[PDB]
Structure 1
Amino acid sequence: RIWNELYKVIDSSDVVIHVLDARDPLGTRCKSVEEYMKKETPHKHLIYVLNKCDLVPTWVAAAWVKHLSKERPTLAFHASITNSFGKGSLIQLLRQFSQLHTDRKQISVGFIGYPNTGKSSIINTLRKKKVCQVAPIPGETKVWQYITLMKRIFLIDCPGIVPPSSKDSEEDILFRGVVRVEHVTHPEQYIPGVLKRCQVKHLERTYE
C-alpha cells in the first residue's frame, strides 16, 4: 500500500523533493528510487532537501550540502511553522520550476523520503499552517495529500518509504528512526549502538 502511494505520487509529480536527515543523509537516501526516476522518468526534476539542519553543527550541514551538490541541487532546511530556515529559498526554487514549466498550467511537487524525515513538517512550513498531520512516531502519514501552495503550485505529501536491502541491518534501520520502539523485543541489545553513535560527554550531560 505504501509503495503504491509512492508510485502514485511520483507519477503525479513534476518536481520530486527527496528529503534527507541532516544527521545521516546517506543513511536516509533512497538510491533505488533515484535510479528508477533517472531511468524511466527523466523529465521529472529530482532535488535534495536536507531537513533537520538545526540538529547538526553548521559546518556539518555546509559540508553535506557541498558534497550532495556534486550530484543534485541540495537545499539546507529547518522545518518549523513559526521559526524556520530555508523557506524563502525553497519557495523561490519552486517558482523557478513553475516559470520553466509555465505552459503546464500547474506543476506538482511530491515529497518523498524515509519515515520521520519531516516531509509533512516541510509542507506545513511552506504553507505557514498545520495542513498535514505531524508526529514523532514513524508512519503518521498513510495516504497522499494535495496541498495548494500557490495557484500554479501543488504539493503532494507521501508516506515514508524504506527500500528493502540486505546490508541494512535491524540496528541500522532502528537508528534511522524508522520503527516504533514500543514494538521491539530487546532494546538493551541496541543500547550499545547508542553508546557507539553518541559522545560520552553528550550522553552524560543529557542524563546527568
Structure 2
Amino acid sequence: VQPDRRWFGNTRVISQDALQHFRSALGETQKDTYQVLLRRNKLPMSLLEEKDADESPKARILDTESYADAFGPKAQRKRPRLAASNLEDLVKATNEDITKYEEKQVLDDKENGWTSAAKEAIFSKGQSKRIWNELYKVIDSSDVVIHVLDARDPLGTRCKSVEEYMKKETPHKHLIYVLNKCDLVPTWVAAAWVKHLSKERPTLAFHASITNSFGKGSLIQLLRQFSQLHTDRKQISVGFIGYPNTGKSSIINTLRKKKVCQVAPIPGETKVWQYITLMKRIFLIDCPGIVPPSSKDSEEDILFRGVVRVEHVTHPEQYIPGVLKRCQVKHLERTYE
C-alpha cells in the first residue's frame, strides 16, 4: 500500500446546515402504502437520531457505592436510602403493597403430583432451522418478498417478528401482502380485510387455481410494475413466504397457468424451494411454511391453522370441541348433515 494524502485524506465531510435540514425533514418521512423504497441515501443517521424525550434512564448508582459498601463484610451502607419522610406514609405504602400483592395472588395439577404429557414433536414444525434457513435464503435472494395470508384468518396467518427483520436488515425489500383463498370466505370479509391491511401493505386479492381464477392479471401487472421499477437490476426475483398450506405453490402455478409446483392439501408438500421463470424478467420462488414460535402459540390454535398434520396427533378427538368455537352451528348442520 503506497503512502498517499488519501487514507489520511478526508472523504465524507458535510456541512452542519445539511444536518439541520435533515433534522427538519425527519418529520416529513411519512409514506403512502403504495410508495416503495428503491435506495436509502447514506446519511449520518446517528446525528439525526436521539429524538426529544423525558425518560432519563436510571443513574449509574454503581459509581458512588458499587458492591462493597452496599453489602458484605465492610457493609458501609449504615442506613437505608431515601429516608422515608413519615411513618404514616410508610404505613400507607405498606397497605398499598399488601393490597397489590393480594391482587397479584388473586390472578391464580401439581397438587396431585401428575405432570403434563410431553408435547408431540409434530407441533414443533416448522422448527429445526431447516425451513428457517430456506426462508432466509429465499428472502435474501428475492428482490421483492411477498407474504400471503389466509383469507379465513389473515391476522392469525401473520409471520410476525420476520417482517420486522425484513424492515430492519433489508429496508429495500417491499414485502407486499397477498390475500389468497378469497373463495372460502364471504367477499365482504375479504373486502374488509384488504381495507384494513391497505394501511400498511397493498394486500392484493387472489384465488389460486390453474382453472379460472380471480386477480391473476392484477398480480401480473403488479409484478410487471415492480420489474419496471428495477430496470438497472437486470431482473427482479420474487419469493413467496407465509404459513404452511397457504397456497403459495398454488399461487405460483396460477401465475404460470400450469401445474409447475407440486401442490397438495398437506402442509408439507413444499419440501424445498425451486426456481421458476415467467417473462424472463422475473423469477418466482417459494419456501416451506414458516411458524414463528411463541409461548402464545396455543398448540390447538396451531392445529386449527393447519400447520400440523392431523394424522399424527395422539388425541384427535380432544380437538373436536374447538371446531364449534369458530364454525357456525348452521353450517356444520347443513354440511354433514
TM-score higher than 0.5: yes
- In our comparison, the structure showing a higher alpha carbon Rg is 2
Partner of 2:296, secondary structure, is coil
TM-score (norm 2): 0.61
Shift of 1:172: 0.6
Q: Measure, in 1, the Cα distance between the counterparts of 2:307 and 2:253.
A: 21
Partner Cα distance (2:169, 2:229) in 1: 21
Deviations 1:173-196 (A, max 9, x none): 000011000000111211110011
**2:324 equivalent among 187, 195, 204:** 195
Q: Following TM superposition, by how much is the alpha carbon of 1:144 offset from its aligned partner in structure 2, in angstroms?
A: 0.9
Deviates more, 1:117-126 or 1:142-151: 142-151
Partner of 1:45: 174
* DSSP-derived class of the 2:177 partner: strand
TM-score normalised to the size of structure 1? 0.99
CA distance in 1: counterparts of 2:311 and 2:160, whole angstroms: 29
Deviations 1:10-51 (A, max 9, x none): 010111110100001011001111000001000111101101
Give the root-mean-square deviation of aligned CA atoms: 0.6
Q: CA deviation at 1:95?
A: 0.4
Is 1:186 matched with 2:315?
yes
SS at match of 1:178: coil
Q: Equivalent residue of 2:200, what SS?
A: coil
SS in 1 for 2:268: coil
Where is the strand percentage greater, Structure 1 or Structure 2? 1
C-alpha distance in 1 between matches for 2:167 and 2:271: 26
CA distance in 1, matches of 2:174, 2:274: 20
CA distance in 2, matches of 1:2, 1:119: 15
Moved over 3 A (4+): none
Structure 1 gaps, min length 5: none
The 2-side partners of 1:156 and 1:150 are apart by: 14
- Give 1:151 deviation, angstroms: 1.1
Alpha-carbon distance in 1 for matches of 2:242, 2:278 = 20
CA distance in 2, matches of 1:189, 1:24: 22
Q: SS of the residue aligned with 1:66?
A: helix
Q: Which protein has greater RCO, CA pairs closer than 8 Å, 6+ apart?
A: 1
